[PDB]
Protein backbone atom coordinates (compact mmCIF):
# COMPACT_ATOMS: atom_id res chain seq x y z
CA UNK A 1 0.00 0.00 0.00
CA UNK A 2 1.22 3.56 -0.73
CA UNK A 3 1.93 5.89 2.27
CA UNK A 4 2.49 9.68 2.52
CA UNK A 5 -0.99 10.91 3.53
CA UNK A 6 -3.45 8.38 5.06
CA UNK A 7 -6.52 9.31 7.11
CA UNK A 8 -7.49 6.56 9.56
CA UNK A 9 -5.72 8.85 12.02
CA UNK A 10 -7.23 12.16 10.92
CA UNK A 11 -9.99 11.81 13.53
CA UNK A 12 -10.17 9.37 16.36
CA UNK A 13 -13.22 7.75 17.91
CA UNK A 14 -15.74 8.58 15.25
CA UNK A 15 -19.21 7.19 15.26
CA UNK A 16 -20.00 5.95 11.83
CA UNK A 17 -23.64 6.04 12.94
CA UNK A 18 -24.34 9.51 11.52
CA UNK A 19 -24.69 11.78 8.48
CA UNK A 20 -24.62 15.31 10.00
CA UNK A 21 -20.82 15.17 10.26
CA UNK A 22 -20.07 17.83 7.63
CA UNK A 23 -16.48 18.01 8.79
CA UNK A 24 -15.33 14.37 9.33
CA UNK A 25 -17.29 13.15 6.45
CA UNK A 26 -15.66 15.84 4.30
CA UNK A 27 -12.40 14.24 5.41
CA UNK A 28 -12.65 11.73 2.51
CA UNK A 29 -13.85 14.04 -0.21
CA UNK A 30 -10.73 14.76 -2.29
CA UNK A 31 -11.67 17.00 -5.28
CA UNK A 32 -14.63 15.87 -7.37
CA UNK A 33 -16.20 14.78 -4.10
CA UNK A 34 -15.22 11.19 -4.85
CA UNK A 35 -14.91 8.75 -1.97
CA UNK A 36 -11.36 8.66 -0.75
CA UNK A 37 -10.79 4.73 -0.74
CA UNK A 38 -9.41 1.82 1.37
CA UNK A 39 -6.46 3.44 -0.28
CA UNK A 40 -6.80 6.15 2.38
CA UNK A 41 -9.29 5.42 5.13
CA UNK A 42 -7.47 2.10 5.67
CA UNK A 43 -10.75 0.92 7.20
CA UNK A 44 -11.66 -2.81 7.36
CA UNK A 45 -14.35 -4.41 5.29
CA UNK A 46 -16.69 -3.44 8.15
CA UNK A 47 -15.50 0.08 7.69
CA UNK A 48 -15.51 0.84 3.98
CA UNK A 49 -18.92 -0.71 4.24
CA UNK A 50 -20.82 1.13 7.00
CA UNK A 51 -18.72 4.23 6.69
CA UNK A 52 -19.61 4.18 3.09
CA UNK A 53 -23.34 3.67 3.89
CA UNK A 54 -23.41 6.87 5.76
CA UNK A 55 -21.31 8.63 3.16
CA UNK A 56 -24.37 7.66 1.28
CA UNK A 57 -26.99 8.83 3.77
CA UNK A 58 -24.99 12.07 3.58
CA UNK A 59 -25.06 12.79 -0.14
CA UNK A 60 -28.59 11.44 0.14
CA UNK A 61 -30.45 13.99 2.01
CA UNK A 62 -27.62 16.20 0.94
CA UNK A 63 -25.06 18.64 2.13
CA UNK A 64 -22.08 17.16 0.28
CA UNK A 65 -21.74 17.13 -3.58
CA UNK A 66 -21.25 13.38 -4.21
CA UNK A 67 -18.98 14.73 -6.97
CA UNK A 68 -18.39 18.28 -8.06
CA UNK A 69 -16.96 20.61 -10.67
CA UNK A 70 -13.28 20.30 -9.95
CA UNK A 71 -11.49 23.65 -9.71
CA UNK A 72 -7.75 23.30 -10.48
CA UNK A 73 -7.31 20.83 -13.28
CA UNK B 1 -43.98 -9.00 12.88
CA UNK B 2 -42.03 -11.69 14.89
CA UNK B 3 -43.37 -10.89 18.43
CA UNK B 4 -40.87 -12.68 20.72
CA UNK B 5 -43.00 -12.06 23.78
CA UNK B 6 -46.34 -13.53 22.97
CA UNK B 7 -44.04 -16.07 21.35
CA UNK B 8 -42.59 -17.36 24.54
CA UNK B 9 -46.03 -17.11 26.08
CA UNK B 10 -47.37 -19.72 23.73
CA UNK B 11 -44.21 -21.86 23.67
CA UNK B 12 -45.56 -21.97 27.19
CA UNK B 13 -49.34 -22.63 26.75
CA UNK B 14 -48.05 -25.68 24.90
CA UNK B 15 -44.93 -27.08 26.52
CA UNK B 16 -47.09 -29.19 28.82
CA UNK B 17 -44.36 -28.74 31.44
CA UNK B 18 -42.84 -25.26 32.15
CA UNK B 19 -39.44 -26.81 31.44
CA UNK B 20 -39.74 -27.29 27.68
CA UNK B 21 -37.10 -24.77 26.50
CA UNK B 22 -36.95 -26.77 23.28
CA UNK B 23 -39.22 -29.70 22.51
CA UNK B 24 -41.33 -31.32 19.83
CA UNK B 25 -44.15 -29.27 21.33
CA UNK B 26 -42.37 -26.07 20.52
CA UNK B 27 -40.96 -27.12 17.13
CA UNK B 28 -44.70 -27.41 16.58
CA UNK B 29 -46.05 -24.22 18.09
CA UNK B 30 -43.38 -22.26 16.31
CA UNK B 31 -43.11 -23.68 12.85
CA UNK B 32 -46.90 -23.45 12.91
CA UNK B 33 -47.33 -19.82 13.94
CA UNK B 34 -44.55 -18.71 11.67
CA UNK B 35 -45.72 -20.76 8.82
CA UNK B 36 -49.09 -19.05 9.16
CA UNK B 37 -48.61 -15.32 9.49
CA UNK B 38 -45.74 -15.79 7.04
CA UNK B 39 -47.92 -17.50 4.46
CA UNK B 40 -50.70 -15.00 4.89
CA UNK B 41 -48.09 -12.42 3.89
CA UNK B 42 -47.07 -14.56 0.89
CA UNK B 43 -50.61 -14.02 -0.27
CA UNK B 44 -50.67 -10.23 -0.30
CA UNK B 45 -47.54 -10.18 -2.39
CA UNK B 46 -47.48 -12.91 -4.99
CA UNK B 47 -43.82 -12.86 -5.91
CA UNK B 48 -40.89 -13.76 -3.59
CA UNK B 49 -40.45 -17.20 -4.89
CA UNK B 50 -37.14 -17.43 -2.94
CA UNK B 51 -38.77 -17.11 0.49
CA UNK B 52 -41.94 -18.86 -0.61
CA UNK B 53 -39.53 -21.68 -1.28
CA UNK B 54 -37.84 -21.63 2.04
CA UNK B 55 -41.21 -21.50 3.79
CA UNK B 56 -41.81 -24.62 1.80
CA UNK B 57 -38.84 -26.49 3.08
CA UNK B 58 -39.83 -25.33 6.56
CA UNK B 59 -43.41 -26.54 6.49
CA UNK B 60 -41.94 -29.79 5.31
CA UNK B 61 -39.60 -29.95 8.27
CA UNK B 62 -42.30 -29.34 10.78
CA UNK B 63 -44.77 -31.79 9.33
CA UNK B 64 -42.00 -34.48 9.25
CA UNK B 65 -41.00 -33.94 12.81
CA UNK B 66 -44.68 -34.58 13.56
CA UNK B 67 -44.15 -37.68 11.45
CA UNK B 68 -41.92 -38.98 14.15
CA UNK B 69 -44.43 -37.58 16.65
CA UNK B 70 -46.72 -40.28 15.46
CA UNK B 71 -43.89 -42.81 15.01
CA UNK B 72 -43.25 -43.11 18.72
CA UNK B 73 -46.60 -41.80 19.83
CA UNK B 74 -49.37 -40.19 17.91
CA UNK B 75 -51.60 -40.30 20.96
CA UNK B 76 -50.49 -37.27 22.87
CA UNK B 77 -49.73 -36.31 19.26
CA UNK B 78 -53.36 -36.33 18.06
CA UNK B 79 -54.05 -34.31 21.12
CA UNK B 80 -51.53 -31.79 19.65
CA UNK B 81 -53.14 -32.06 16.27
CA UNK B 82 -56.23 -31.12 18.11
CA UNK B 83 -54.96 -28.19 20.19
CA UNK B 84 -53.51 -26.65 17.09
CA UNK B 85 -55.83 -27.27 14.17
CA UNK B 86 -53.47 -28.05 11.25
CA UNK B 87 -53.95 -31.31 9.33
CA UNK B 88 -57.69 -31.84 9.52
Amino acid sequence: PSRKAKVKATLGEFDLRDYRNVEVLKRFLSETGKILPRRRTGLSAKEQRILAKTIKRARILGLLPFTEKLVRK
Amino acid sequence: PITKEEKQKVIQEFARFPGDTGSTEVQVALLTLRINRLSEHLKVHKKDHHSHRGLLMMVGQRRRLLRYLQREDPERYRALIEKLGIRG
Binding site: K8, D15, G62, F66 | -
Partner: protein, 101 residues
Protein backbone atom coordinates in the same frame (compact mmCIF):
# COMPACT_ATOMS: atom_id res chain seq x y z
CA UNK C 1 -44.26 1.50 17.70
CA UNK C 2 -40.49 1.72 17.23
CA UNK C 3 -38.35 4.71 16.89
CA UNK C 4 -36.66 6.30 13.98
CA UNK C 5 -34.96 9.59 13.55
CA UNK C 6 -36.91 12.08 11.40
CA UNK C 7 -34.58 13.99 9.28
CA UNK C 8 -36.35 16.16 6.88
CA UNK C 9 -35.48 19.42 5.04
CA UNK C 10 -38.07 22.05 4.27
CA UNK C 11 -37.86 25.15 2.05
CA UNK C 12 -35.50 28.10 2.72
CA UNK C 13 -37.43 31.08 1.36
CA UNK C 14 -39.92 30.53 4.18
CA UNK C 15 -40.82 32.99 6.93
CA UNK C 16 -42.83 33.60 10.06
CA UNK C 17 -46.42 32.38 10.16
CA UNK C 18 -45.46 30.01 7.38
CA UNK C 19 -42.80 28.32 9.43
CA UNK C 20 -45.81 28.19 11.81
CA UNK C 21 -48.56 26.60 9.73
CA UNK C 22 -46.45 24.00 7.87
CA UNK C 23 -44.21 22.94 10.75
CA UNK C 24 -47.31 22.53 12.94
CA UNK C 25 -48.98 20.57 10.07
CA UNK C 26 -45.85 18.51 10.53
CA UNK C 27 -47.00 18.12 14.10
CA UNK C 28 -50.60 17.16 14.19
CA UNK C 29 -50.00 15.04 11.18
CA UNK C 30 -47.26 13.15 12.92
CA UNK C 31 -49.50 12.59 15.85
CA UNK C 32 -52.48 11.64 13.73
CA UNK C 33 -50.27 8.88 12.38
CA UNK C 34 -48.78 7.77 15.70
CA UNK C 35 -45.81 10.04 16.00
CA UNK C 36 -44.90 11.76 19.22
CA UNK C 37 -41.44 13.18 19.64
CA UNK C 38 -38.54 11.95 21.76
CA UNK C 39 -35.96 14.48 20.50
CA UNK C 40 -37.34 17.81 19.25
CA UNK C 41 -34.24 19.27 17.52
CA UNK C 42 -33.29 20.83 14.15
CA UNK C 43 -30.20 22.87 13.39
CA UNK C 44 -32.03 25.72 11.67
CA UNK C 45 -31.25 26.88 8.13
CA UNK C 46 -28.14 25.70 6.37
CA UNK C 47 -26.61 25.38 2.93
CA UNK C 48 -25.63 22.23 1.06
CA UNK C 49 -22.86 21.13 -1.23
CA UNK C 50 -25.24 20.90 -4.22
CA UNK C 51 -28.00 23.34 -5.41
CA UNK C 52 -31.07 21.20 -4.85
CA UNK C 53 -34.54 22.72 -4.53
CA UNK C 54 -33.12 25.16 -7.11
CA UNK C 55 -31.41 26.67 -4.05
CA UNK C 56 -27.95 26.50 -2.31
CA UNK C 57 -29.59 26.53 1.14
CA UNK C 58 -32.77 25.60 3.01
CA UNK C 59 -34.17 24.82 6.45
CA UNK C 60 -33.50 21.45 8.06
CA UNK C 61 -35.54 19.82 10.77
CA UNK C 62 -34.61 16.83 12.90
CA UNK C 63 -36.83 15.22 15.56
CA UNK C 64 -36.30 11.65 16.49
CA UNK C 65 -39.24 9.77 17.82
CA UNK C 66 -41.54 6.96 18.50
CA UNK C 67 -44.12 5.95 15.94
CA UNK C 68 -46.16 3.04 14.70
CA UNK C 69 -43.41 1.28 12.67
CA UNK C 70 -45.00 0.83 9.21
CA UNK C 71 -46.81 4.18 9.38
CA UNK C 72 -43.45 5.58 8.47
CA UNK C 73 -43.98 5.15 4.73
CA UNK C 74 -47.42 6.68 5.11
CA UNK C 75 -46.75 9.88 7.00
CA UNK C 76 -43.60 10.20 4.97
CA UNK C 77 -45.74 10.53 1.86
CA UNK C 78 -48.00 12.87 3.86
CA UNK C 79 -44.89 15.01 4.38
CA UNK C 80 -43.18 15.11 1.02
CA UNK C 81 -46.72 16.24 0.29
CA UNK C 82 -46.22 19.83 1.29
CA UNK C 83 -44.19 20.89 -1.70
CA UNK C 84 -41.37 22.69 0.10
CA UNK C 85 -40.33 19.45 1.82
CA UNK C 86 -37.06 19.54 -0.12
CA UNK C 87 -36.15 16.18 1.40
CA UNK C 88 -38.25 13.72 3.38
CA UNK C 89 -35.96 11.20 5.24
CA UNK C 90 -36.62 8.67 8.06
CA UNK C 91 -34.19 6.17 9.56
CA UNK C 92 -34.34 3.26 11.97
CA UNK C 93 -33.03 4.50 15.33
CA UNK C 94 -29.47 3.06 15.84
CA UNK C 95 -26.30 4.99 16.65
CA UNK C 96 -23.39 2.85 17.92
CA UNK C 97 -20.00 2.32 16.29
CA UNK C 98 -16.73 3.84 17.37
CA UNK C 99 -14.23 3.46 14.62
CA UNK C 100 -10.62 4.56 15.33
CA UNK C 101 -10.48 3.98 19.12
Amino acid sequence: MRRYEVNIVLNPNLDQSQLALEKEIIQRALENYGARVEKVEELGLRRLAYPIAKDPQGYFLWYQVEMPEDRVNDLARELRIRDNVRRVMVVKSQEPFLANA
